[PDB]
DNA sequence: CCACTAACCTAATCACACC
DNA sequence: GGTGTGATTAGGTTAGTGG
């Protein structure tokens, strides 16, 4: 099972593609500050902005720094308990990562993360 | 029925710490 | 240099939205 996926209002979307309009990159400041501006969890905004450039560079192809999010910190106890499930399931639900993240403390974004990073490597 | 797109994915790479 | 790992990128896939 997959996250409830949003509709966005008017209101966002413009605001979305007018921040995007000036910076097709940002960081995790432009990210955070739109992100509560519109009543948005940034990780949406993130997944937006991937999205966006991928069919803005996909239709160009047809028609033609900002700081990061600072690194989270994974203490050897968080590890091992994200390392069992990944050997349980390497695919977690969107039900399976909120409760890892609650048993963590740890956003479920960056669960994901670790999850992407894990699969990729071992 | 079907076009669009958030959500999700892989593969590669960047960034930063570390010995 | 060489490892390890979180975060980001290009771009493809899955599945919900809505014409």
Redesign the pocket.
């Known amino acids: ?8 209002t008017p209101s966002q ?1 413009e605001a ?1 593609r007018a921040c995007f309009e000036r910076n ?5 400041a432009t ?1 955070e500050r739109l992100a509560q501006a519109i009543g948005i969890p940034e ?2 905004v ?10 803005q ?2 239709q160009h ?1 047809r028609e033609s ?10 203490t050897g106890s968080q ?1 091992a308990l ?1 390392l069992r499930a990944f050997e349980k399931d ?5 039900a399976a ?1 909120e409760e890892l993240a609650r048993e963590t403390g740890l ?1 479920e ?2 669960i ?11």
């Open positions: 099972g997959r996250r409830r996926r949003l509709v966005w979307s979305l097709p990159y940002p960081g995790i990210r990780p949406r993130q997944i937006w902005f991937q999205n966006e450039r991928s069919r560079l996909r192809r720094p900002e700081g990061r999010r600072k690194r989270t910190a994974v590890t994200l390497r695919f977690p639900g969107i990562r956003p974004s960056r994901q993360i670790w999850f992407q990073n894990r699969r990729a490597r071992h």
